[PDB]
Amino acid sequence: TAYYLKDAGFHIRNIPKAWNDWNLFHVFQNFGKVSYCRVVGQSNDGQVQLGFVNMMSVADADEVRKNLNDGNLIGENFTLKVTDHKN
Amino acid sequence: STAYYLKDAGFHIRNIPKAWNDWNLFHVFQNFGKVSYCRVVVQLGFVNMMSVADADEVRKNLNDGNLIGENFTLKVTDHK
Amino acid sequence: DQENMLKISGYPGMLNTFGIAQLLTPYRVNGITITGAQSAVVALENKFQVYQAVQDFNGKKLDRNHKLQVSSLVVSSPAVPL
Amino acid sequence: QENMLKISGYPGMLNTFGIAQLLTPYRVNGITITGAQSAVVALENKFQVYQAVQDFNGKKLDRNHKLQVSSLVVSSPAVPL
């Protein structure tokens, strides 16, 4: 829906319902600089949210991918489903 | 926007061989860092480096203010 | 729009608006307002780039004569603690 | 004319500030956009143009973008090195 740096972005699903965009942002900031960070909707009765995160560079996005486990970002107390944004 | 170039990054050059033009002076200083400005007026000259870091390297390669090549000795002083 | 803005100062006085933008690499600059001052008010893409720029650049030593000062109205505000 | 360089290959999203950011630390005076991914840039003088073309021609920004940077400027010493 907008102009993004090829291979730098990610669609997020399964975000805990209490997070705002700052939460989502701080997760991806641990891997590099962030360009856009956005909660884009709700799902499953309102129990999880959808997100979109664009990193400042492809290198930064690949730093995210390197910490990915079959498409999932496992942290302490949450698991996000991170998926490559294709244009 | 001010009138003066970056502090501690310029040099005055005396003792430039008379056949040199700005490109000759430029290439001597390029070996120490990126160069921002370069002019010739033996002859006098001015070189501003891109940053203080570049210009400090220039200063790290001097003998009582002299730049020594195989056929030349440039006298170099801080523009302050 | 308040949270796209940061103030930056302490950069070398010879910079033009492109040079102020170079200071802020790699964040997206949409506008720079220059005044009678040796500071500038910069509009970035969004609050997250502003937040990161203040982090990255506030206090950064450019050289013995220039220590950047960067500041903004943006506070990191997680809904639940991190 | 000796202040000009041509740059292309950068991401199509860059505004002119983003194009100037590519050329850090060289001083940029004007940018004229000539395509989605090409621009003509006026730098400070011919030595910055010459140096920019050295530093940035063929520079790989990432796996999807490679800069092509060119100019009319050539190194023309009066006496060889």
Residue numbers in the entry:
A (entry chain A): 6 to 92
B (entry chain B): 5 to 45, 53 to 91
C (entry chain C): 200 to 281
D (entry chain D): 201 to 281
Task: Give the exact sentences the study uses for this entry.
By using functional proteomics, we and another group independently identified a piRNA biogenesis and chromosome segregation (PICS) complex (also named as PETISCO) that plays important roles in 21U-RNA biogenesis, chromosome segregation and cell division. The PICS complex is composed of TOFU-6, PICS-1 (also names as PID-3), ERH-2 and two mutually exclusive factors, PID-1 and TOST-1. The PID-1 containing complex is functional in piRNA maturation and processes piRNA precursors at 5′ termini via its association with IFE-3, while the TOST-1 containing form is essential for chromosome segregation and cell division in embryos. Complemented by biochemical and mutagenesis experiments, our structural biology data support that PICS is an octamer composed of two copies of each subunit, and unveil the assembly interface within PICS complex.
Consistent with previous work, PICS-1(PID-3) and TOFU-6 interact with each other via RRM domains, which were previously identified as the RNA binding modules. Given that the two structures are almost identical, the native one was used for structural analysis. TOFU-6C primarily interacts with PICS-1A through α1-β2 of TOFU-6C, and α2 and a C-terminal fragment of PICS-1A. Specifically, Trp27, Phe30, His31, and Cys42 of TOFU-6C, make hydrophobic interactions with Lys246, Phe247, and Tyr250 of PICS-1A. Asp26 and Gln34 of TOFU-6C form salt bridges with Lys246 and Gln254 of PICS-1A, respectively. Tyr8 and Leu10 of TOFU-6C make hydrophobic contacts with Pro211, Met213, and His265 of PICS-1B. Asp12 and Asp67 of TOFU-6C form salt bridges with Arg263 of PICS-1B. The PICS-1(PID-3) F217E mutant, which disrupts the homodimerization, failed to associate with perinuclear granules.
